[PDB]
């Protein structure tokens, strides 16, 4: 394939080049939030982000080389993980707040508008505080997000040998970035480990948020888009 030939800096440039846009909400700050309204806002935002994520996934080096259903499978298992790590990344410079959209900045208490949502908010906030504590770099963020796409569904499947080879290359890219930043080898291994352990918690937030969405889907507080229902019934 072509992804294996990429150098380290060319890998970072490609990932940074494919970054999806930051979308604005349909939010009106004159209106107060009903539980159905805030859920409709969040799910509407997540639906529009999914369209850009699908196009972002196609530019992730090595992802197009996969067969169609393997691409479908990886996106179906990792879509909420990718949305959440992006939300956590956007919210790094807003302590105690979640920047869903530049015009939609929410805190803990507003998460209580929805049943069981404040539990998800606190995990997302705690993840954002960890990135800010580690001072995550954008070059490291795009690598982690590509790791989520390729790793989260690989064991739920030659196709794996290609994915694992691309994953090894992203690992080399992460190490190459940390070596450029002046980190010693011990610091490189530790930071690489610290970053990868975050993904365990991101999987946990996605699983809980996946069950919170399926709950709100059955209670019919607000309907969601058909694309969002397709991903939701994959879980």
């Amino acid at each position: 394939s072509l992804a294996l030939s990429l150098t380290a800096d060319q890998m970072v440039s490609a990932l940074l080049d494919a970054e999806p846009p930051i979308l604005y909400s349909e939010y009106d700050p004159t209106r107060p939030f009903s539980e159905a309204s805030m859920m409709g806002l969040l799910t509407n935002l997540a639906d529009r982000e999914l369209v850009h994520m699908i196009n972002w996934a196609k530019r992730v080096p090595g992802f197009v080389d996969l067969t169609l259903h393997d691409q479908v499978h990886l996106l179906e298992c990792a879509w909420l993980e990718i949305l959440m790590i992006g939300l956590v990344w956007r919210s790094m410079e807003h302590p105690g707040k979640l920047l869903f959209a530049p015009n939609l900045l929410l805190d803990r208490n507003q998460g209580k508008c929805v049943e069981g949502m404040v539990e998800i908010f606190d995990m997302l906030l705690a993840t954002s505080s960890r990135f800010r504590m580690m001072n995550l770099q954008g070059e490291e963020f795009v690598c982690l997000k590509s790791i989520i796409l390729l790793n989260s569904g690989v064991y739920t499947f030659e196709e794996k040998d290609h994915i694992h080879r691309v994953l090894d290359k992203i690992t080399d890219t992460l190490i190459h970035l940390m070596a450029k930043a002046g980190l010693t080898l011990q610091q490189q291994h530790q930071r690489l480990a610290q970053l990868l352990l975050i993904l365990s918690h991101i999987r946990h937030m996605s699983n809980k948020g996946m069950e919170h969405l399926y709950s709100m889907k059955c209670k019919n507080v607000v309907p969601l888009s058909d694309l969002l229902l397709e991903m939701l019934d994959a879980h």
Partner: peptide
């Protein structure tokens, strides 16, 4: 699937 459609083009 919609996802298959958006992935196709």
């Amino acid at each position: 699937k919609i996802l298959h459609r958006l992935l196709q083009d």
